Amino acid sequence: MYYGISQFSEAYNKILRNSSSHSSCQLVIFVSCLNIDALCATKMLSLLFKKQLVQSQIVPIFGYSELRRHYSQLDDNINSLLLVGFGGVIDLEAFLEIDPQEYVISFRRDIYVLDAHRPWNLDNIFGSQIIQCFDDGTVDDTLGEQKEAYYKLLRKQRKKQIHEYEGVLEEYYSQGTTVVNSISAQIYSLLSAIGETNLSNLWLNILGTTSLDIAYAQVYNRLYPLLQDEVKRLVKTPDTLTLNIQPDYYLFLLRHSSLYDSFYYSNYVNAKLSLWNENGKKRLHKMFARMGIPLSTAQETWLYMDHSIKRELGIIFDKNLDRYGLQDIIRDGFVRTLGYRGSISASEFVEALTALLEVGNSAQKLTNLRKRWVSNFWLSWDALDDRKVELLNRGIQLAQDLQRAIFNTGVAILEKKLIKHLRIYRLCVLQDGPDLDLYRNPLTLLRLGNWLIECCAESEDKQLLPMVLASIDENTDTYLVAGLTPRYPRGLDTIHTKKPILNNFSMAFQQITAETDAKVRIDNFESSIIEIRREDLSPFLEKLTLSGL
Amino acid sequence: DSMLKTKQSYLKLNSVENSLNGFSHLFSKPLMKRVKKLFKNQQEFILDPQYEADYVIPVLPGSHLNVKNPLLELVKSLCHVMLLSKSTILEIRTLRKELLKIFELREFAKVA
């Protein structure tokens, strides 16, 4: 590894020695837009560097084209560059035509790349001094064999060594993309080693770690005990700040919507009870009748809902939910209280943040959409501070609206049975419908796909197949296609969790694009999301069917 | 040839005219199979680089239509030629709908 966890401080010190100036901006940060973990890490770094009065600039980017253009725009005065949330999986020198001898003098510049994706570029590690990253504890142990081959490959019977090195390189490659650690977790480890931890840093770390609960529950379970221990280590006067470990549930905005709406829109309960048809609603009313909560009472706001049943909710759940297999909904979460404003939870906060990212406020309109996404990112960043709550209530209401729209589309998809089951992977295309203009956002599409994946996984089928989802935007006449990995049921043991399911969709897409002249545009930071033409989709799909996955 | 054959057969027998009513029945099935095969081959060989020469849409003076799929215009012209019968309209419309069902299009779409 280049920078081990223990060496972080040293690198940090170098930054000061290269950036502490009186009237010169010598540090520029590029962040992975449309990502909560990147936003949390950027906020923590911004507070850190505001503490020591180090001048800096924050610049969000969306695609690799923007990255290259902005790197070209930069001047030699900028000694230090940060690249947080991306850049691990590719070699930047080839992308950025970086001449080491142009930047030798050594260390003319410094580029600190900080990314989470476990498979990445090995040459970026073992080849270049100029590019440097923070390892999470992967190169030291996992990559012990590949480095020998790379070092050796950097008399007539010696071709066996070359063949073995090529085979080792191929074996290391051809691996699907995954995430195994958190940028916010790494930054908080650095802060703990330095000695600047406080409640704001802990809150941002909690947000960053809980933003992965949807997709990387294994990583979340690995990281939870450290957060628990650290929060243990660290009269209701109007200035108290309380961070407590209170029981919580896999429910959608439980403390801001009615309990009925929470049970109705919770994805896990939807999957477990088939709420898209009438039998699900009948079983939900059975649930409520057997628990004993009146329907008109349970359809009231959580603030005005009855105090006695608010107190007895835990016992009611513990005694009622065993029969119907929902006993996995109970978990332990973090609750934040500051003043007389009320109480909030990490799950609700991240849902509000995601919704505010989604909704806020040919090539020309694509640029306009990307600019609007950048503006939404800035608005979500501004909403972080505790001095603004009209920028969080709006996010909560937008989250409710977006979940309603997603549910309305998903029930229609399920009833029309548009999910076509092929021999290898399932396919679904949204040709027509209402409110299709919302799904131009990749995160909205991923939310819809996550709900569909949960619904499909909570079934009696014994086939684990990837799902391909596509949409339409009539103004551009293009299909936005996203590849999705299968997921195990949340109520499963760790024995059958040897490795997370890998994503080969990016590899398949890049291979097909490199062998055929399709009019695609692969520029998103997420390598499994591409834009394809309506006329070109079908042959492309056929190729994907006939190619080795 | 089919039209000439059916007119000769009618004359042999003796706004509607029976000289031509019943001529599309002779070639419907081979046409359907040929169109299926052509669609499959176009789907398979449209994205290949070396086969892109034969799918190039020619340009001529006075042309104004920009369009993508050649087989669609082939079948559109083939059906429009038949539609000039003015006496077997329903049969031609049925055959046109059947041909369009091979594509994922509808009877009264603007693209058709």
mmCIF file of C-alpha atoms in Angstrom, chain A residues 43-335:
data_model
loop_
_atom_site.group_PDB
_atom_site.id
_atom_site.type_symbol
_atom_site.label_atom_id
_atom_site.label_comp_id
_atom_site.label_asym_id
_atom_site.label_seq_id
_atom_site.Cartn_x
_atom_site.Cartn_y
_atom_site.Cartn_z
ATOM 1 C CA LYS A 43 -18.064 18.540 5.194
ATOM 2 C CA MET A 44 -15.659 17.025 7.720
ATOM 3 C CA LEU A 45 -12.623 18.132 5.698
ATOM 4 C CA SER A 46 -14.079 21.620 5.262
ATOM 5 C CA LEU A 47 -14.521 22.018 9.015
ATOM 6 C CA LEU A 48 -11.024 20.636 9.640
ATOM 7 C CA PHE A 49 -9.379 23.059 7.219
ATOM 8 C CA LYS A 50 -11.478 25.971 8.455
ATOM 9 C CA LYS A 51 -10.100 25.291 11.939
ATOM 10 C CA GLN A 52 -6.485 25.966 10.899
ATOM 11 C CA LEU A 53 -7.344 28.889 8.569
ATOM 12 C CA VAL A 54 -6.157 27.101 5.417
ATOM 13 C CA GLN A 55 -7.693 28.699 2.334
ATOM 14 C CA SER A 56 -9.420 26.287 -0.035
ATOM 15 C CA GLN A 57 -12.025 25.832 -2.764
ATOM 16 C CA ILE A 58 -14.746 23.207 -3.269
ATOM 17 C CA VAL A 59 -15.685 22.145 -6.804
ATOM 18 C CA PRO A 60 -18.287 19.443 -7.535
ATOM 19 C CA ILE A 61 -18.118 17.430 -10.751
ATOM 20 C CA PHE A 62 -20.461 14.969 -12.454
ATOM 21 C CA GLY A 63 -18.667 13.119 -15.262
ATOM 22 C CA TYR A 64 -15.179 12.182 -16.374
ATOM 23 C CA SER A 65 -15.361 14.778 -19.151
ATOM 24 C CA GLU A 66 -15.889 17.480 -16.529
ATOM 25 C CA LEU A 67 -13.003 16.041 -14.505
ATOM 26 C CA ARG A 68 -10.614 16.193 -17.460
ATOM 27 C CA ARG A 69 -11.746 19.666 -18.540
ATOM 28 C CA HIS A 70 -11.383 21.109 -15.040
ATOM 29 C CA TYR A 71 -7.979 19.465 -14.606
ATOM 30 C CA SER A 72 -6.927 21.132 -17.854
ATOM 31 C CA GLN A 73 -8.246 24.443 -16.500
ATOM 32 C CA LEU A 74 -6.001 24.272 -13.420
ATOM 33 C CA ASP A 75 -2.819 26.303 -12.950
ATOM 34 C CA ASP A 76 0.542 25.119 -11.630
ATOM 35 C CA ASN A 77 0.102 27.256 -8.494
ATOM 36 C CA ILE A 78 -2.261 24.673 -6.982
ATOM 37 C CA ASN A 79 0.132 22.441 -5.050
ATOM 38 C CA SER A 80 -2.462 20.017 -3.651
ATOM 39 C CA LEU A 81 -5.495 18.353 -5.227
ATOM 40 C CA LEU A 82 -8.055 16.131 -3.513
ATOM 41 C CA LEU A 83 -10.190 13.622 -5.435
ATOM 42 C CA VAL A 84 -12.795 12.197 -3.047
ATOM 43 C CA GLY A 85 -15.413 9.612 -3.974
ATOM 44 C CA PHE A 86 -14.060 8.328 -7.304
ATOM 45 C CA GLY A 87 -10.977 7.750 -9.424
ATOM 46 C CA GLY A 88 -9.811 4.485 -7.874
ATOM 47 C CA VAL A 89 -10.737 2.116 -10.694
ATOM 48 C CA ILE A 90 -8.856 3.879 -13.519
ATOM 49 C CA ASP A 91 -5.296 5.043 -14.144
ATOM 50 C CA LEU A 92 -5.315 8.832 -13.924
ATOM 51 C CA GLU A 93 -1.970 9.356 -15.672
ATOM 52 C CA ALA A 94 -3.246 7.791 -18.892
ATOM 53 C CA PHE A 95 -6.494 9.729 -18.488
ATOM 54 C CA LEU A 96 -4.773 13.025 -17.635
ATOM 55 C CA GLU A 97 -1.602 12.565 -19.770
ATOM 56 C CA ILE A 98 0.563 13.261 -16.729
ATOM 57 C CA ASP A 99 4.274 13.473 -17.524
ATOM 58 C CA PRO A 100 6.363 12.581 -14.442
ATOM 59 C CA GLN A 101 9.370 14.394 -15.930
ATOM 60 C CA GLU A 102 7.305 17.543 -16.460
ATOM 61 C CA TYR A 103 6.506 17.490 -12.721
ATOM 62 C CA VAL A 104 9.991 16.468 -11.547
ATOM 63 C CA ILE A 105 12.236 18.962 -9.775
ATOM 64 C CA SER A 106 10.142 15.462 -7.407
ATOM 65 C CA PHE A 107 6.701 16.380 -6.021
ATOM 66 C CA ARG A 108 5.901 19.395 -8.173
ATOM 67 C CA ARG A 109 2.242 18.655 -7.358
ATOM 68 C CA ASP A 110 0.340 16.221 -5.161
ATOM 69 C CA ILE A 111 -2.915 14.428 -5.975
ATOM 70 C CA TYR A 112 -4.583 12.618 -3.069
ATOM 71 C CA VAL A 113 -7.279 10.270 -4.368
ATOM 72 C CA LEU A 114 -9.626 8.819 -1.748
ATOM 73 C CA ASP A 115 -12.132 6.239 -2.999
ATOM 74 C CA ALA A 116 -13.964 3.237 -1.591
ATOM 75 C CA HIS A 117 -14.393 0.794 -4.495
ATOM 76 C CA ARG A 118 -12.542 -2.376 -3.626
ATOM 77 C CA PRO A 119 -11.396 -3.490 -7.100
ATOM 78 C CA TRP A 120 -9.210 -0.759 -8.586
ATOM 79 C CA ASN A 121 -6.190 -0.100 -10.776
ATOM 80 C CA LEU A 122 -3.031 -1.888 -9.687
ATOM 81 C CA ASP A 123 -0.756 0.145 -11.949
ATOM 82 C CA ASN A 124 -2.080 3.276 -10.233
ATOM 83 C CA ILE A 125 -0.669 1.752 -7.038
ATOM 84 C CA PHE A 126 2.660 0.243 -8.012
ATOM 85 C CA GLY A 127 3.713 2.462 -10.918
ATOM 86 C CA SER A 128 3.405 6.182 -10.244
ATOM 87 C CA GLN A 129 4.821 8.274 -7.413
ATOM 88 C CA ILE A 130 2.780 11.357 -8.324
ATOM 89 C CA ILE A 131 -0.605 9.701 -7.708
ATOM 90 C CA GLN A 132 -1.165 8.646 -4.104
ATOM 91 C CA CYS A 133 -4.133 7.230 -2.209
ATOM 92 C CA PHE A 134 -5.227 6.156 1.267
ATOM 93 C CA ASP A 135 -5.505 2.386 1.574
ATOM 94 C CA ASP A 136 -8.158 0.920 3.864
ATOM 95 C CA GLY A 137 -6.119 -2.196 4.653
ATOM 96 C CA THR A 138 -6.463 -4.107 1.385
ATOM 97 C CA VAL A 139 -3.133 -3.922 -0.456
ATOM 98 C CA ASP A 140 -1.156 -5.135 2.564
ATOM 99 C CA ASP A 141 -2.984 -8.481 2.726
ATOM 100 C CA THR A 142 -5.144 -9.196 -0.338
ATOM 101 C CA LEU A 143 -2.745 -7.923 -3.023
ATOM 102 C CA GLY A 144 0.269 -9.877 -1.750
ATOM 103 C CA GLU A 145 0.445 -12.031 -4.884
ATOM 104 C CA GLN A 146 -0.360 -9.609 -7.719
ATOM 105 C CA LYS A 147 2.435 -7.194 -6.796
ATOM 106 C CA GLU A 148 5.110 -9.834 -7.401
ATOM 107 C CA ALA A 149 3.849 -10.371 -10.944
ATOM 108 C CA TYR A 150 3.606 -6.637 -11.610
ATOM 109 C CA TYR A 151 7.111 -5.986 -10.274
ATOM 110 C CA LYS A 152 8.574 -8.833 -12.327
ATOM 111 C CA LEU A 153 6.770 -7.751 -15.513
ATOM 112 C CA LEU A 154 7.475 -4.021 -15.112
ATOM 113 C CA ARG A 155 16.798 -18.017 -22.033
ATOM 114 C CA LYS A 156 14.229 -19.525 -24.396
ATOM 115 C CA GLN A 157 12.444 -21.194 -21.456
ATOM 116 C CA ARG A 158 11.863 -17.879 -19.645
ATOM 117 C CA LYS A 159 8.526 -17.371 -21.436
ATOM 118 C CA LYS A 160 6.891 -19.430 -18.680
ATOM 119 C CA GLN A 161 7.424 -16.519 -16.284
ATOM 120 C CA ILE A 162 5.801 -14.085 -18.729
ATOM 121 C CA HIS A 163 2.863 -16.447 -19.240
ATOM 122 C CA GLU A 164 2.412 -16.845 -15.477
ATOM 123 C CA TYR A 165 2.558 -13.076 -14.947
ATOM 124 C CA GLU A 166 -0.043 -12.503 -17.668
ATOM 125 C CA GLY A 167 -2.281 -15.175 -16.157
ATOM 126 C CA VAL A 168 -1.950 -13.648 -12.691
ATOM 127 C CA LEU A 169 -2.815 -10.196 -14.040
ATOM 128 C CA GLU A 170 -5.860 -11.586 -15.852
ATOM 129 C CA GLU A 171 -6.982 -13.444 -12.723
ATOM 130 C CA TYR A 172 -6.676 -10.276 -10.645
ATOM 131 C CA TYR A 173 -8.736 -8.459 -13.264
ATOM 132 C CA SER A 174 -12.143 -9.708 -14.455
ATOM 133 C CA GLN A 175 -13.630 -8.959 -11.023
ATOM 134 C CA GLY A 176 -16.892 -7.140 -10.424
ATOM 135 C CA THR A 177 -17.067 -3.750 -8.762
ATOM 136 C CA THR A 178 -17.766 -3.587 -5.022
ATOM 137 C CA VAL A 179 -17.413 -1.287 -2.000
ATOM 138 C CA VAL A 180 -15.965 -2.455 1.330
ATOM 139 C CA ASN A 181 -15.262 0.681 3.398
ATOM 140 C CA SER A 182 -16.389 4.252 4.032
ATOM 141 C CA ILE A 183 -14.592 7.496 3.262
ATOM 142 C CA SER A 184 -16.187 9.117 6.307
ATOM 143 C CA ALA A 185 -14.977 6.201 8.438
ATOM 144 C CA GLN A 186 -11.414 6.666 7.192
ATOM 145 C CA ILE A 187 -11.554 10.415 7.834
ATOM 146 C CA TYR A 188 -12.902 9.858 11.343
ATOM 147 C CA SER A 189 -10.117 7.360 12.041
ATOM 148 C CA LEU A 190 -7.649 10.048 10.968
ATOM 149 C CA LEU A 191 -9.382 12.580 13.233
ATOM 150 C CA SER A 192 -9.270 10.153 16.161
ATOM 151 C CA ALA A 193 -5.546 9.639 15.605
ATOM 152 C CA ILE A 194 -5.007 13.411 15.434
ATOM 153 C CA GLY A 195 -7.147 14.531 18.380
ATOM 154 C CA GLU A 196 -9.904 16.791 17.011
ATOM 155 C CA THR A 197 -12.984 14.598 17.532
ATOM 156 C CA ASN A 198 -16.256 16.159 18.660
ATOM 157 C CA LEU A 199 -20.015 15.774 18.331
ATOM 158 C CA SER A 200 -20.295 17.340 14.870
ATOM 159 C CA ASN A 201 -17.635 14.959 13.554
ATOM 160 C CA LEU A 202 -19.391 12.009 15.192
ATOM 161 C CA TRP A 203 -22.725 13.019 13.643
ATOM 162 C CA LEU A 204 -21.196 13.340 10.177
ATOM 163 C CA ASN A 205 -19.462 9.966 10.568
ATOM 164 C CA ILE A 206 -22.751 8.377 11.637
ATOM 165 C CA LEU A 207 -24.490 9.806 8.564
ATOM 166 C CA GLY A 208 -21.720 8.574 6.279
ATOM 167 C CA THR A 209 -21.774 5.075 7.739
ATOM 168 C CA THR A 210 -25.575 4.752 7.739
ATOM 169 C CA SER A 211 -25.906 5.920 4.131
ATOM 170 C CA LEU A 212 -24.739 2.404 3.128
ATOM 171 C CA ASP A 213 -27.443 0.461 4.991
ATOM 172 C CA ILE A 214 -29.495 0.014 1.813
ATOM 173 C CA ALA A 215 -26.854 -1.642 -0.368
ATOM 174 C CA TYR A 216 -23.864 -2.724 1.768
ATOM 175 C CA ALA A 217 -25.444 -4.080 4.939
ATOM 176 C CA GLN A 218 -22.376 -6.291 5.428
ATOM 177 C CA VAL A 219 -20.130 -3.215 5.551
ATOM 178 C CA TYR A 220 -22.638 -1.508 7.840
ATOM 179 C CA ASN A 221 -22.605 -4.465 10.237
ATOM 180 C CA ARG A 222 -18.805 -4.529 10.188
ATOM 181 C CA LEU A 223 -18.634 -0.804 10.984
ATOM 182 C CA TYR A 224 -21.435 -0.526 13.575
ATOM 183 C CA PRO A 225 -19.554 -1.655 16.744
ATOM 184 C CA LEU A 226 -16.859 1.004 16.329
ATOM 185 C CA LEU A 227 -19.523 3.715 16.148
ATOM 186 C CA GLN A 228 -21.284 2.250 19.185
ATOM 187 C CA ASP A 229 -18.091 2.205 21.257
ATOM 188 C CA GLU A 230 -17.099 5.717 20.185
ATOM 189 C CA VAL A 231 -20.510 7.201 20.998
ATOM 190 C CA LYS A 232 -20.308 5.428 24.359
ATOM 191 C CA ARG A 233 -16.928 7.073 24.954
ATOM 192 C CA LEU A 234 -18.296 10.507 24.033
ATOM 193 C CA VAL A 235 -32.364 19.021 33.066
ATOM 194 C CA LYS A 236 -33.398 19.800 29.481
ATOM 195 C CA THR A 237 -31.741 23.180 29.169
ATOM 196 C CA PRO A 238 -32.308 24.745 25.721
ATOM 197 C CA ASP A 239 -28.705 23.972 24.697
ATOM 198 C CA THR A 240 -28.371 20.248 25.445
ATOM 199 C CA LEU A 241 -27.146 17.948 22.678
ATOM 200 C CA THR A 242 -28.166 14.315 23.155
ATOM 201 C CA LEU A 243 -26.858 11.417 21.063
ATOM 202 C CA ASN A 244 -28.459 8.198 22.281
ATOM 203 C CA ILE A 245 -28.777 4.608 21.089
ATOM 204 C CA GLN A 246 -32.540 4.161 20.953
ATOM 205 C CA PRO A 247 -34.366 1.242 19.320
ATOM 206 C CA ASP A 248 -35.627 1.978 15.815
ATOM 207 C CA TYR A 249 -37.223 0.087 12.949
ATOM 208 C CA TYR A 250 -36.930 -0.305 9.189
ATOM 209 C CA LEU A 251 -39.718 2.225 8.675
ATOM 210 C CA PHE A 252 -40.186 5.189 6.347
ATOM 211 C CA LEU A 253 -40.166 8.451 8.343
ATOM 212 C CA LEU A 254 -41.734 6.931 11.442
ATOM 213 C CA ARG A 255 -41.355 10.068 13.572
ATOM 214 C CA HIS A 256 -42.659 12.433 10.875
ATOM 215 C CA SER A 257 -45.551 10.522 9.277
ATOM 216 C CA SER A 258 -48.400 8.456 10.650
ATOM 217 C CA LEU A 259 -47.691 4.902 11.774
ATOM 218 C CA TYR A 260 -50.099 3.580 9.136
ATOM 219 C CA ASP A 261 -48.279 5.371 6.318
ATOM 220 C CA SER A 262 -44.968 4.184 7.751
ATOM 221 C CA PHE A 263 -46.044 0.528 7.698
ATOM 222 C CA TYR A 264 -47.571 1.068 4.254
ATOM 223 C CA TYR A 265 -44.516 2.598 2.572
ATOM 224 C CA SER A 266 -41.842 0.546 4.355
ATOM 225 C CA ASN A 267 -40.080 -1.474 1.657
ATOM 226 C CA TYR A 268 -39.341 -4.520 3.815
ATOM 227 C CA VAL A 269 -42.945 -4.896 4.973
ATOM 228 C CA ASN A 270 -44.127 -4.293 1.406
ATOM 229 C CA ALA A 271 -41.924 -7.134 0.176
ATOM 230 C CA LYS A 272 -42.890 -9.457 3.032
ATOM 231 C CA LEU A 273 -46.657 -8.897 2.770
ATOM 232 C CA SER A 274 -47.341 -8.180 -0.939
ATOM 233 C CA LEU A 275 -49.028 -4.813 -0.443
ATOM 234 C CA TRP A 276 -49.462 -4.202 -4.183
ATOM 235 C CA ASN A 277 -52.673 -6.280 -4.287
ATOM 236 C CA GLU A 278 -55.689 -6.271 -1.986
ATOM 237 C CA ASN A 279 -54.618 -9.260 0.121
ATOM 238 C CA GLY A 280 -51.697 -7.211 1.411
ATOM 239 C CA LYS A 281 -54.049 -4.489 2.621
ATOM 240 C CA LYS A 282 -56.260 -7.121 4.254
ATOM 241 C CA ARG A 283 -53.250 -8.573 6.077
ATOM 242 C CA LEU A 284 -52.167 -5.081 7.165
ATOM 243 C CA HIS A 285 -55.600 -4.441 8.649
ATOM 244 C CA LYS A 286 -55.304 -7.829 10.359
ATOM 245 C CA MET A 287 -51.986 -6.647 11.814
ATOM 246 C CA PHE A 288 -53.555 -3.480 13.172
ATOM 247 C CA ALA A 289 -56.639 -5.216 14.575
ATOM 248 C CA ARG A 290 -54.560 -7.846 16.367
ATOM 249 C CA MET A 291 -52.199 -5.233 17.796
ATOM 250 C CA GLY A 292 -55.239 -3.311 19.030
ATOM 251 C CA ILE A 293 -54.360 0.160 17.750
ATOM 252 C CA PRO A 294 -57.519 1.801 16.351
ATOM 253 C CA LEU A 295 -57.286 2.603 12.656
ATOM 254 C CA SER A 296 -58.343 6.234 13.106
ATOM 255 C CA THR A 297 -55.812 6.566 15.932
ATOM 256 C CA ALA A 298 -52.999 4.989 13.884
ATOM 257 C CA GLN A 299 -53.795 7.363 11.012
ATOM 258 C CA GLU A 300 -52.756 10.362 13.135
ATOM 259 C CA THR A 301 -49.505 12.303 13.331
ATOM 260 C CA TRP A 302 -46.780 10.954 15.606
ATOM 261 C CA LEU A 303 -46.752 14.153 17.679
ATOM 262 C CA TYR A 304 -50.440 13.911 18.610
ATOM 263 C CA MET A 305 -50.657 10.107 18.697
ATOM 264 C CA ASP A 306 -51.634 8.691 22.079
ATOM 265 C CA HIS A 307 -48.962 8.740 24.780
ATOM 266 C CA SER A 308 -49.916 5.371 26.286
ATOM 267 C CA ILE A 309 -49.503 3.461 23.035
ATOM 268 C CA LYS A 310 -46.392 5.516 22.260
ATOM 269 C CA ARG A 311 -44.957 4.133 25.499
ATOM 270 C CA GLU A 312 -46.207 0.581 24.880
ATOM 271 C CA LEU A 313 -45.283 0.377 21.175
ATOM 272 C CA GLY A 314 -42.167 -1.686 21.861
ATOM 273 C CA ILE A 315 -44.024 -4.333 23.851
ATOM 274 C CA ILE A 316 -46.880 -4.346 21.331
ATOM 275 C CA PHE A 317 -44.468 -5.033 18.473
ATOM 276 C CA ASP A 318 -42.519 -7.642 20.446
ATOM 277 C CA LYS A 319 -45.727 -9.525 21.228
ATOM 278 C CA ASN A 320 -47.490 -9.188 17.856
ATOM 279 C CA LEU A 321 -44.888 -9.342 15.069
ATOM 280 C CA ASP A 322 -43.656 -12.911 15.641
ATOM 281 C CA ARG A 323 -46.538 -14.659 13.866
ATOM 282 C CA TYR A 324 -46.071 -12.965 10.495
ATOM 283 C CA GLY A 325 -42.289 -13.070 10.126
ATOM 284 C CA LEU A 326 -41.622 -9.340 10.526
ATOM 285 C CA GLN A 327 -39.459 -9.718 13.647
ATOM 286 C CA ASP A 328 -36.396 -8.610 11.646
ATOM 287 C CA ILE A 329 -37.645 -5.003 11.520
ATOM 288 C CA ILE A 330 -36.366 -4.190 15.033
ATOM 289 C CA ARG A 331 -32.879 -2.685 15.253
ATOM 290 C CA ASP A 332 -30.859 -0.125 17.220
ATOM 291 C CA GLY A 333 -30.239 3.356 15.830
ATOM 292 C CA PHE A 334 -28.918 6.787 16.735
ATOM 293 C CA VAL A 335 -31.163 9.636 17.890
#
